[PDB]
Structures are given as structure tokens and as C-alpha cells.
């Protein structure tokens, strides 16, 4: 009741005690890189409906797309062809996944089931949730850090279909997650304006960051392991930390009203892409909110985004069945 | 080599694009529905109805309801203060950004439940009510035609010619004869003809 209202004030005093300066003040440094732009180098016109989420492969070529038409097309970003075209049980999928060994593709959406495919037939249908799924990632070839909408990030085992650790307790719908480069801890943005980093080893919360005013759509992670950025439905992309526990910047302009749909960093972390909702996707510079390119294109949405393992060419999805590759 | 690798995938690029175009003539002929408050497929005179459902998902609908923005008709089944909490749902589907161009079908519930309990108004503008005609009793048709007027009181303030409400009073032939009216009135508003 009232016995826990004073313990939170010990954190708000401590998190403001470590606020020595700002990123906006200590970056009196070299100039921004000017207006950058990218032209659509490919166009993967194969789908029939909206692309809700894709995932660029670990091979830096073979991306996997997942649309609401029932298709899971394992594309090819080099010869534009289609290596496979996997049909699905239920017509909706909201996320797809790619193993780092390049030999597994996981996909599953509003049908409450994370299915496992091996690049054509099913392998294991890891049911057990009581909500829609929102993001699936691979740790190794037998372990996935799934999200849900039932307030619970889980961790299945593809051998014998068991839930090893249930990262429970978020008081709201969970949305897209990410993964550290060390693959031992993962953040989870959710519909409570709270990006709560968990821990795979222990199996509970390690921190909890709150800097948003509305629900969180998608999230990313920094390419070293000491930060992560988060986009929400109020046209903002806040950049948090892990050793200072406070947000540093807020990437927002005056005119933008539409909410963020997907966020992913570059290879060196300097360029923070952001898939907006007003039919384009900006390129925010991570040390100063310069907005160094409008990067137009699609005419319905920018529903998902993803950068390669080598940082070569991003792949903004859409809601009119067109992927585009930008280098 | 560099001559068999290009033919390694072009035999798979042209065995798949000859299959997707044989599946494109099935997705284009399936009409998606949504029985808003587990899939089912029925047909009526050789057209495929891909009626969805939401039964297992929780009661917080703001992120699996923008996943249904290509559906042609949201079957908004409602009952006859249960109405007021089930009208702000319809108030929010209408004024939404992604479900804006989706013409809602509305099914009021069993009319004997509004006929047994009258022989309880919960609204201020129910006493001064001038009832319309073409019903059956005047003590029942004055009550049934109020929520059928209240649900249509919002549907004309943001109609804009794109999406209308098509209220009924309860059967697959009554959706087939109304899903045709959605397709005809969609093709007519783009011709600058309606």
C-alpha cells in the first residue's frame, strides 16, 4: 500500500544523483555528416498482402519475410529470386525469425503458436501461450526468446517442447524485443511505457526504465552492449542506458505526429534508423538529432525494418507487399 | 561454376512464381470477415467467405485490431449499462485511423429479449422519442428502434461516403446480400458516381 511508495523515491533520488550532464551538452564535437540518402537497390515484389514483419538473415543475404497472406517467403537479396515459399496454417503472422546458423526459420503470430521451420515442413509447434505473439528471436538452434501479449516473455526449448523460464510480470501487453551481442540478456518494450531489461541466467528483472508517455511499439539494442534505443507511439525515439539507468536524448521534431513502428541501429551505432507511420522512415543521428534524411518510398506504412549482420543494406518493409533494399 | 549457379535458382525462381500466381486466384476470391464481440469458411453461390474470429485474445484491443485493416466487413455483434460499454467500442472502431475505410455490419441481438423485459431505458433522450414506422407492437418498436437509431447516430457524423453501418435485427444470406452491397458501393465511390 503506502509502504512501497517511499522505496520508489529512493530510486528517483539515486537516478537523478548520477545525472552529471547530458549527451546534448558533452557532444560539442565534429559536425554531423550532412544530408545522406539511399535509393531502392532492389524491390522484392512477391507478396499478396501487407508485410507485417521481416528479419534479415545472419548470412547477410537471405532475408525472410512474413506477410498476412499466409506466405513466408525466404527471399534472396542478391539475385532477387525466391529460395522457398512456405505456406502457413493460420493466415496471420506478426513476426518471423532467423537462426544464426542459417538452418532454421521460426515464424508465428496471432494464432498464439510459435512454429518452427527448417529451410518447408514444420518441426515443433511450441504452443502454451494465452495471447498473441509479437517478436521471436533465436539464441541457438534449440532456444528462442519469444515475446507474447500475455505480459510474459518466455524461453522455450525446441527439444520436447518445454518452457524453461517465464519472465513474468509486466502489467501490460508486451511488444517487440531485442537481444544483446553476448546473448545472455534481453530487453522488452511493452504497452506500459516501460522498457524492462530481463536476465536469461537468473530469470527475473535486472532494471526497469521509464521515459515514455505512451505505449512502446518496437525496440532495438546498441551494437556494443551498453545501451538501447526505444520508439513509442508519441513520435519519439528515446535512447536509454545500462550503466547510468537514465535516458539521454529524445529524438523528436515539431511536425511529426505519427508513432514509431520499428527501430534498428547501424553497424557502428552512429545512425539510428526509425520506421515511422507517415509512409516514410527517418535516419536519426545518435549523437545529435539532426534527421539527416527523409528517405521516402512506400505508400502505405513502414511496418518493419532490419539491418544486416555486416551493416550493408537495410530492408524496410511496407503495407503494400513491397520490400525495398537501401544501400 | 558461374553458369550452373544462375540456373540453380532460376529453376526455383520460375517454379515458385508459377505457383504463387496459381494461389493468387484463391486469395483474391476469399472474402475476409471478423466476428467481433477459430476461423470458419462458408460459401454462398460460389464465393468464398474467410470469416475470422477473436475468441482467445484478451480484452485489450488496440494492437490486434490494426491487424484487421484489410477486412471487408467487421461483423459487430452486440446485445440489446451493457450497451454503453459496447458503444464506445463502436465509437472507437469508427474514428480509428486504420479501421477507417472498413464498413461495419451491425447485428442487434434477439428481439424477444427486448420484448419480454418491457412487458430500464437507461437513456435521457428516450421519453421524447418520435418513433418511425415500417416494423411489431408500439411498446416494443419504440424501444428496439432506439438503439438502432443510437448506433446510427454516430455512423452518419463520420460517414464520408467510404464506410456505412448496415444494421440488421436477428442468416448467412443476410450477410451475402450485404457483403455484395459493400463491393458495389466501394466501386461506385471511386468512379465519382455515388
Amino acid at each position, epitope marked *: 500500500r503506502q509502504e512501497a511508495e517511499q522505496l520508489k523515491n529512493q530510486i528517483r533520488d539515486a537516478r537523478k544523483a548520477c545525472a552529471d550532464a547530458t549527451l546534448s551538452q558533452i557532444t560539442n564535437n565534429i559536425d554531423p555528416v550532412g544530408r545522406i540518402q539511399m535509393r531502392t537497390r532492389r524491390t522484392l515484389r512477391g507478396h499478396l498482402a501487407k508485410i507485417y514483419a521481416m528479419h534479415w538473415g545472419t548470412d547477410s543475404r537471405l532475408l525472410v519475410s512474413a506477410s498476412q497472406d499466409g506466405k513466408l517467403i525466404i527471399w534472396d537479396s542478391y539475385t532477387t529470386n525466391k529460395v522457398h515459399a512456405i505456406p502457413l496454417r493460420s493466415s496471420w503472422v506478426m513476426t518471423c525469425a532467423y537462426a544464426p546458423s542459417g538452418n532454421y526459420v521460426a515464424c508465428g503470430g496471432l494464432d498464439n503458436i510459435c512454429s518452427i521451420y527448417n529451410l518447408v515442413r514444420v518441426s515443433r509447434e511450441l504452443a502454451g501461450h494465452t495471447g498473441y505473439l509479437s517478436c521471436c528471436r533465436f539464441l541457438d538452434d534449440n532456444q528462442i526468446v519469444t515475446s507474447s501479449g500475455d505480459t510474459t516473455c518466455a524461453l522455450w526449448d525446441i527439444e520436447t517442447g518445454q518452457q524453461t523460464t517465464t519472465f513474468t510480470g509486466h502489467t501490460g501487453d508486451v511488444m517487440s524485443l531485442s537481444l544483446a551481442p553476448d546473448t545472455r540478456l534481453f530487453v522488452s518494450g511493452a504497452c*506500459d511505457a*516501460s522498457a524492462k531489461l530481463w536476465d536469461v541466467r537468473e530469470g527475473m528483472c535486472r532494471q526497469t526504465f521509464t521515459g515514455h508517455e*505512451s505505449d512502446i511499439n518496437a525496440i532495438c539494442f546498441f551494437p556494443n552492449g551498453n545501451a538501447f534505443a526505444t520508439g513509442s507511439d508519441d513520435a519519439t525515439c528515446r535512447l536509454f542506458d545500462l550503466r547510468a539507468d537514465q535516458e539521454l536524448m529524445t529524438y523528436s521534431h515539431d511536425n511529426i*505526429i505519427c508513432g514509431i513502428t520499428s527501430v534498428s541501429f547501424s553497424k557502428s551505432g552512429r545512425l539510428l534508423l526509425a520506421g515511422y507511420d507517415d509512409f516514410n522512415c527517418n535516419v536519426w543521428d545518435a549523437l545529435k538529432a539532426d534527421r539527416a534524411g527523409v528517405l521516402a518510398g512506400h505508400d502505405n506504412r513502414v511496418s518493419c525494418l532490419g539491418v544486416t549482420d555486416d551493416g550493408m543494406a537495410v530492408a524496410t518493409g511496407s503495407w503494400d507487399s513491397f520490400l525495398k533494399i537501401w544501400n | 561454376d558461374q553458369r550452373n549457379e544462375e540456373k540453380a535458382q532460376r529453376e526455383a525462381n520460375k517454379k515458385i512464381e508459377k505457383q504463387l500466381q496459381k494461389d493468387k486466384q484463391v486469395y483474391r476470391a476469399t472474402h475476409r470477415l471478423l466476428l467481433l464481440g477459430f476461423e470458419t469458411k462458408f460459401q454462398v453461390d460460389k464465393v468464398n467467405f474467410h470469416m475470422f474470429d477473436v475468441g482467445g485474445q484478451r480484452d485489450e484491443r488496440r494492437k490486434w485490431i490494426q491487424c484487421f485493416n484489410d477486412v471487408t466487413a467487421i461483423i459487430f455483434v452486440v446485445a440489446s*449499462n451493457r450497451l454503453q460499454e459496447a458503444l464506445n467500442l463502436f465509437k*472507437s472502431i469508427w474514428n480509428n*485511423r486504420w479501421l477507417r475505410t472498413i464498413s461495419v455490419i451491425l447485428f442487434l441481438n434477439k428481439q424477444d429479449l427486448l420484448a419480454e423485459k418491457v412487458l430500464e431505458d437507461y437513456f435521457p433522450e428516450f421519453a421524447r422519442y418520435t418513433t418511425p414506422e415500417d416494423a411489431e407492437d408500439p411498446r416494443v418498436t419504440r424501444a428496439k428502434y432506439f438503439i438502432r437509431d443510437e448506433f446510427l447516430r454516430i455512423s452518419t457524423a463520420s460517414g464520408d461516403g467510404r464506410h456505412y453501418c448496415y444494421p440488421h435485427f436477428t442468416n448467412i444470406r443476410r450477410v451475402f446480400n450485404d457483403c455484395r452491397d459493400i463491393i458495389q458501393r466501394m466501386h461506385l465511390r471511386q468512379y465519382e458516381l455515388l
Partner: nanobody
Amino acid sequence: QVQLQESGGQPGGSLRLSCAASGFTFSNYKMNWVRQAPGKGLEWVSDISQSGASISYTGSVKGRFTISRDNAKNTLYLQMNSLKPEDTAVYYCARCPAPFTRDCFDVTSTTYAYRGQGTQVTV
């Protein structure tokens, strides 16, 4: 964070309920009150638009009460003129989950928790 505190308190008297909004911008949020009598589920009571235009109500609390947001002190006020014995309810000050919209899904169950309790009003 998003702190929604509440304040304020014989059938037929009067009551005035005040709140706060610390953490977000208050100029562009479609705030609304939601009450729940004990034993039953949550109902709807009122609404306030982004400027003070579309002041809606429910069926039974129509005309009696009067609500106006301030938009200068991050506060909205629910003036309860001519109260009733059927208003024995706890009054949660809800929130509209997206800036610059005209829809609200803020009626349902306990899927939001980071908010003050809301004062208990009995008759």
C-alpha cells in the same frame, strides 16, 4: 513516469474531484473519467476532448455533472452537482493511450496499473 493522482472526497449534496498529470504533455490527450461501483465491473461516466469540445456522458449521469479540463495546470475537474444514491463508486481517472486521436479503449479490466487509486465517492 505517468503519474495519475486523484484528490477530493447524504444523497443530494455536491462534490468536486481534482486530479494531476505529471510526466506527459496534457494539451493533446483525450482524458476521461471511469467509475466502478463495487461488486460489478467498470462502467463509463464522462469524456473530455483535446480542447473542451466533445463533452460526452453516459446514460444516467447525463446533465447532472459537469466536467472541464484546465490544460494549464495539468488538471481536469469533475463537478458533481446533484449527486445520487446510485453513485457509490470509486472513480479512476483514465487516459487516452495515443496523442492526437479520436478513439479510446480505456474501459476494460486491470491491464493498466501504473496510476493512482482514485478517490472513493459514497452517498
